[PDB]
Amino acid sequence: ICIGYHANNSTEKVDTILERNVTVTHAKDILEKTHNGKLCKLNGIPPLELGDCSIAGWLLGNPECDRLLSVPEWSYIMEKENPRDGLCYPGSFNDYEELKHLLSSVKHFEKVKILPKDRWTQHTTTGGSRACAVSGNPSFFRNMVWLTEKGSNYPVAKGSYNNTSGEQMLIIWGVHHPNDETEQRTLYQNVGTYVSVGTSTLNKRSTPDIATRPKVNGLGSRMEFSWTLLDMWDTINFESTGNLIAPEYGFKISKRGSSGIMKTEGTLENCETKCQTPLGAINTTLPFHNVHPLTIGECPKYVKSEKLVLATGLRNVPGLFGAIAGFIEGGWQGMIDGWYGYHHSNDQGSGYAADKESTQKAFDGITNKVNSVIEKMNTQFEAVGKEFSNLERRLENLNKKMEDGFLDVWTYNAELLVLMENERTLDFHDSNVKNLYDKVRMQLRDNVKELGNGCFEFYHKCDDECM
Amino acid sequence: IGYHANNSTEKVDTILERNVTVTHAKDILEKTHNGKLCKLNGIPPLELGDCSIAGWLLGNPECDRLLSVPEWSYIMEKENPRDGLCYPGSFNDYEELKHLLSSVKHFEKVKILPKDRWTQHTTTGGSRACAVSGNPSFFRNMVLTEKGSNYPVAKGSYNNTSGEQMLIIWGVHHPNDETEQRTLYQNVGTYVSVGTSTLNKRSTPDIATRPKVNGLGSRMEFSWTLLDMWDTINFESTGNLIAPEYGFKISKRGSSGIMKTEGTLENCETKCQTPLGAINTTLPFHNVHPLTIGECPKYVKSEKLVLATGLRNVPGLFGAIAGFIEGGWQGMIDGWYGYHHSNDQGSGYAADKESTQKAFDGITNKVNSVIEKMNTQFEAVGKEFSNLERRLENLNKKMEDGFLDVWTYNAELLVLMENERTLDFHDSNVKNLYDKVRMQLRDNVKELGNGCFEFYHKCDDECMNSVKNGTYD
Amino acid sequence: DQICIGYHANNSTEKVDTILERNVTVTHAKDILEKTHNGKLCKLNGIPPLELGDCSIAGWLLGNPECDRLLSVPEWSYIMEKENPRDGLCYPGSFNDYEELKHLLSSVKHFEKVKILPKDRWTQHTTTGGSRACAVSGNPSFFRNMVWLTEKGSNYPVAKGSYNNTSGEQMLIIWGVHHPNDETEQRTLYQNVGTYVSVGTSTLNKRSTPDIATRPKVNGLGSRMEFSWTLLDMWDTINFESTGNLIAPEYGFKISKRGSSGIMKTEGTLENCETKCQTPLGAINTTLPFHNVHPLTIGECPKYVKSEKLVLATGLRNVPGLFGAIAGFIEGGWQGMIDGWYGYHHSNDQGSGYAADKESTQKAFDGITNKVNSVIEKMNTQFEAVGKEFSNLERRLENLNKKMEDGFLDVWTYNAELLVLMENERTLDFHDSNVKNLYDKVRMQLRDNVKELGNGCFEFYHKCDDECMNSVKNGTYDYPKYEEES
């Protein structure tokens, strides 16, 4: 009876810490490199889809964002890299990044009219600009009111709002910075104006800045916007002697958990995922992926590898223990029932036969190993892509430094874990053949000649009942 | 030739098998605390009770009874205190101030602008928002209103001769209405002006109607600075200034953190404090609580990290243990590996002392490497960010979770990988004990195959020892 | 006659540690922790660093007279700045977003100073004002790149000036506001009392008012100058308007970049060597996965780590084990065997000898080389800066940076140490296994014909000349003979 190990037509290759390009009978890749090329719903909830609009564009009601979808609940934001329709009237948005991060993910979101336009009797309310032109006519941010002089008079404009919505409300306001003192007087009459905003938490007084600037969309003037979270049951007070750009609406918002923004050109598709990249969604149990660094969801660890191949079967031969590709020179393509087994040449016939108990125990072992590498990986929801202003470069560099930091830790460890485990595995199979061999040799004792090639030549006669 | 077995029900997992029973094991995952808030390296924490740092430094009257030490290693503060800005308002760079105060070598209050030297101004102002016994009071540390119907330019200054750096706080009053302004300060276009060698700051009050907070529409906006040794701070104001009377000498140190908790100091010791209790361990990992202060183990998302130290209990790469030697010997109590021997003078179990000792050193070392290579430094973990700092806080979470994942994955696999190497190690030891005996006896014995050698010749106690010894011939 | 299986021994005294043992003497060892530098500050990928001398970046950009002599190159890869220079803001004051400025300047593909608002064009204004705080040769002077605008005649007409960025590149621009000590100063300098400084671009809208107040004197001044900066995009325009107190730029700096680097705090001076990795003590030239030289490096560096040594066993246990061969049933090594790691003795009636088994020595050698290379070449190295700047109101942020850098410190050290402790034992076991296998290969051939002494040797029952020995080492041998038997 002969002792041998399985061999097949496999051309799969793995490396170990001692050998590269070793051919094995079976292998498991543990690096996910496939997506589905689709922007999907994350955990059952769609993304907010901004088209060519930016967040500021959208919130303020740039007329060019009139046709936006708007869902009441979203799980991330889809925004173009360099949108197109933002502040149609030129200016700036204070703490814009914090806002985007606030809005990035929401359980509920609903726009409500909080200070209706027509309540500003005493003030004119129809001022628009050609920078926000619809059909060549002057127009303005659909969610905001430009308050100007009426008749030739601008009385103290007061307006408050008690947040009885039932949820936290995001409110936005603006300050108009004129281009010249003339523009100032023709608009507001008063010359030493201020704009005042107040809650239980907020106290802000702003004074318009009247100066000549380079024209942007045809204007030396600017509008500076700002925001706040009006708490439940708190009240907001607006008071201005000119230059106020009052909100008509607010946004009850209720969140949730915080997510992120995804820069893409694509459009939602009605598939499902727990892990979205800008190239498509990943759906895996694997520990690592190399698809794209900017994921949103619960994702495998991003790693720099091209491949991470774990050996599972043995060395395919057409070791620490000296058996495989050792004193048993090669494998048996004829043995198909298992990894290790017997040959046995009889005067009743020949044949091959796997040793079911020792192949099953090797299989459970290798199954347990693969499962350990895979299920010990802890995966938690993260956004990754982040937003910093032009004055927060250090902070952005901090974040890159850190992201690169984990990239290198995970890459080194994954490359190496794989290298080291492959050599143990190959040694495991070697040990297993060696042990099956020794288990037979310890029985047959003197009754057989030990040929040296893993074969035992019986002195006596041994038929099927003997085998 | 055989190996140890016992009644151990201890389990470990390894990279190939789960739920393996081992004669011995070592847990290397600390998961216990003492339930106490303790002194940190022999230094107490500041106990704010129901007070905020702001309330405490401003002099909120509800804070009169605070303990105050001249030195502390962290700060204890409740989640959402209660006694903060009794008079509604705000505190610029409050979070930067907390981090600075979080740990102090020395901290002494010093009078820098005596209340009574403000002649020309009324100095008695207060509010029912800061009420003590239904009477209007004010921040105990802070002080300026019109006197007669006049608010002359108010100027105060102080040269830091205190021999240390000094924390100095000051305020601006924002009134609810112009009437409130004129009856407080007479003047209208007023300002407050703080200056040092380093700081230049001018503020103007915001008069305006606001939602009532403790019945006040008005607000108080506080700011601070560190006055250097021998530098001077200069206040100037035509109205609306809330001046400091006191300053705080401050010497640091190394920086720490605030601990959000409801407890109270208890007089024990620790090098690692957690919101649940103190941790006293040499163990490389714990899972007590993420928000720790001190020199702590790595925080890991694990329920158990159990490292086999003994062999597999049997009441492997090397085919001996639970292999060609089917079972253990509870009979053998001296060591891990040994001999039985059957004589015409008796029977016996005896452990092989040399090989047991070697393996023991071996394992001892393995446990010590896993444990003593863990580099532990002082850290606070728990951090403070304002509402307008949500990205920053999110970066911090991303980091703490990143590291939480790296150490977890690493601790789980190390334990799995080393557990199987250990069991394999015991296996190799017995194979080698067995092989060592085989290569001596040679022909003089029948090799039964259960790990036993039957002697052709007769082998008394003397010759038994010659086998267990290395001797024999 | 006997043939013996055995293994190499040498005079090495090199020690490694393994998960199970400590201070194990091996015949060969490879260090993977870099600890040597060259003492020099160098060009970094062929590109010199900007050398600032006793100057700070602020002082260099403003044109502190005391920085007049600075070399200045149109491209650098990192900046050298002393810890606490000396020649910064000669006139007391501040610089907003200073730290961001330094970050952006740290590393520049192109840098060129250009004249954007010629001092002489400020007719209607006085332009010659200076201070003895910026004094050259006892005389008042000023920031060489900046213009102090003051009253002329007794008149300060509104000052308007602009610059369209036709330079071809982004341009750094800096301006200042003078904050007087008192109202009389204000009037003697600018006539006007309610002044503002206004600065605007497509992107920037800023209006300041001078703050008039008594402050402690610095360099004898109660006044302060506060500076601000902006990057003007190509084809954008910057507008300055003021009725007083404006400190106006004469120059701007065209800037093209790049990839961003950092500042190195050092007293040293550039020395004309090369490196891809610069540290404050010296340049590092290495292929090694880890270093312990200095935490604050610039370039592509091995991973900094808190260890004193990381030595990897490459040879075997030096004895002049999992498989029981080495320092096992074969008690010792052979100093006499020089040719390889494992081989044969053999003692004939044609003489004695040692000989390495070349095939098994070469395999092992290939194996160990593959292991070292793995540990070494899987390390991914990219370009980083490390050293960082934070203002005094940014201590939490600095703590975040520190916690991060420390956190990675604890990961690499722990992992580096343990990888070495684990690989050393595997290396020792591997050599052991190799010998065991060489041993068994001979046992299986020789069979019955020899006596197995239990020490690694085989005593033959027959006679075995050199051609016979050869057949044993060759794997040939056989065996019918036999003799004896008889």
Ligand SMILES: CC(=O)N[C@H]1[C@H](O[C@@H]2[C@@H](O)[C@H](O)O[C@H](CO)[C@@H]2O)O[C@H](CO)[C@@H](O[C@@H]2O[C@H](CO[C@]3(C(=O)O)C[C@H](O)[C@@H](NC(C)=O)[C@H]([C@H](O)[C@H](O)CO)O3)[C@H](O)[C@H](O)[C@H]2O)[C@@H]1O
């Ligand atoms: C002490 C005082 O001035 N009280 C009330 C004030 O009386 C003024 C009096 O000083 C003057 O000589 O002649 C008339 C007499 O009535 C003046 O008007 O009259 C106001 C109008 O009713 C009251 O306003 C309100 O006060 C409430 C809270 O009052 C306190 C406070 O506890 O916060 C009382 C403090 O003594 C006072 N402190 C100082 C230094 O004046 C403060 C302070 O004025 C404000 O906090 C500053 O913002 O206010 C509520 O504000 C209520 O809504 C409002 O009607 C004066 O109480």
